[PDB]
Amino acid sequence: QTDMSRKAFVFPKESDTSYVSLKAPLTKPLKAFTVCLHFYTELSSTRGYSIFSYATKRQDNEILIFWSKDIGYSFTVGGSEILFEVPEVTVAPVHICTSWESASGIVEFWVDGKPRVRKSLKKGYTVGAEASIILGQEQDSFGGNFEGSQSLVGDIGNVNMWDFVLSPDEINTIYLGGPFSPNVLNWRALKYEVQGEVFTKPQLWP
Amino acid sequence: DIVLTQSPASLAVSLGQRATISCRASQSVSTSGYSYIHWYQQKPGHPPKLLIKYASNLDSGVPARFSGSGSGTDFTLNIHPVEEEDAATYFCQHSWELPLTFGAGTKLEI
Amino acid sequence: QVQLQQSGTELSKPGTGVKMSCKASGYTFISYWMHWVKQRPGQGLEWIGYINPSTDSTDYNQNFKDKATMTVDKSSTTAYMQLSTITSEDSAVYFCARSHYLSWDFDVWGAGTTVTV
Structure with missing residues (x-):
């Protein structure tokens, strides 16, 4: 494990080859999750890019957070996508949380500490525990098949994951940077493998 | 996993003085100014009572003589004035990762 | 009041x-983890694991991953721990404790169940 606190992975160039793979102590397939992230990129005005790619042997794009140039955010589980439209956007470090639940199908997407509308997606699905989690790229195949035109150029960190949908109160505690412990992916106790020209540098955001 | 090594094993204190109990983590357990260390009091025959959370946050219903401190690998619990009620055994715990671990404890003796 | 009541000496x-059971009472059982912790007589503390009642999901100290099995009943706010093929080395007090399921401080504790093997 490494304490990545106050450091972030910086992706200065567009390539298919720069990524970092994160290893999770998963065992049972997920019935719910939260991922919270912090990232800065200027690409949002120019093209779509992968913010968080989760893939499994049976389903590439098993969880994905993406930006679509003309549309805003999109969220995918189990190969099925919902939009979270954001037509006017500003360049700054953005914190987000996504959370999803199999029992309800309800998707919550939080942007810079405010929820979007609670949506619905993939009610009843189950997410594979043999996950290739990749930062910096979108996966067309388990652990690979990256597309350079979908890579992130920018800076990503404070990536945390839970086995469960956080409360609004808990998402607010995380956004304000109070003390919390994630139980599926923990930024202070991270297990990861960097490849290509990726650098670890002190974070731009507070 | 994180070892917490805790010292001394027991502590003989007069009423009215200061008890200082120390805990060493094998790792830094501070990030972003918080530190994932917790202190409990257990009286014999009772379950532990949380005293201090995150090295220094005094829990509600705890007297002001209890005051935790520290950062990084090195933490302490002070009791001052140490008082007859404080005849107890004290444990540090971390919240940094799984598994959660406890110190071996210290027993405070008047 | 918020309390944890355990099943008593086995x-x-x-x-x-x-x-052994751990009835939670006086709070929303779903909003918290239940932890279980071993204590040998006069010696230390030994964390067993947790259960998330919200997700029915558990993790264990690697010394217990084949000894223990935690479960909950959400219909009656009762946590359990089952101890398998128990042996004299398993004789201990076993406490259940609450934590707010983001922060792993053990906020409130059950009285403990003594198991004498």
Whole structure:
């Protein structure tokens, strides 16, 4: 494990080859999750890019957070996508949380500490525990098949994951940077493998 | 996993003085100014009572003589004035990762 | 009031198994984890694991991953721990404790169940 606190992975160039793979102590397939992230990129005005790619042997794009140039955010589980439209956007470090639940199908997407509308997606699905989690790229195949035109150029960190949908109160505690412990992916106790020209540098955001 | 090594094993204190109990983590357990260390009091025959959370946050219903401190690998619990009620055994715990671990404890003796 | 009430002392033989309960009361059982922790008589503390009642999901100290099995009943706010093929080395007080399921401080504790093997 490494304490990545106050450091972030910086992706200065567009390539298919720069990524970092994160290893999770998963065992049972997920019935719910939260991922919270912090990232800065200027690409949002120019093209779509992968913010968080989760893939499994049976389903590439098993969880994905993406930006679509003309549309805003999109969220995918189990190969099925919902939009979270954001037509006017500003360049700054953005914190987000996504959370999803199999029992309800309800998707919550939080942007810079405010929820979007609670949506619905993939009610009843189950997410594979043999996950290739990749930062910096979108996966067309388990652990690979990256597309350079979908890579992130920018800076990503404070990536945390839970086995469960956080409360609004808990998402607010995380956004304000109070003390919390994630139980599926923990930024202070991270297990990861960097490849290509990726650098670890002190974070731009507070 | 994180070892917490805790010292001394027991502590003989007069009423009215200061008890200082120390805990060493094998790792830094501070990030972003918080530190994932917790202190409990257990009286014999009772379950532990949380005293201090995150090295220094005094829990509600705890007297002001209890005051935790520290950062990084090195933490302490002070009791001052140490008082007859404080005849107890004290444990540090971390919240940094799984598994959660406890110190071996210290027993405070008047 | 917020409290945890456990099932009380279990007496059992080598090669048996015991299941001890932890009734939570006075709070929303779903909003918190239940932790379980071992204490040998006069010696230390030994964390067993957790259960998330919200997700029915558990993790264990690697010394217990084949000894223990935690479960909950959400219909009656009762946590359990089952101890498998228990042996004299398993004789201890076993406490259940709450934590707010983001922060792993053990906020409130049950009285403990003594198991004498």
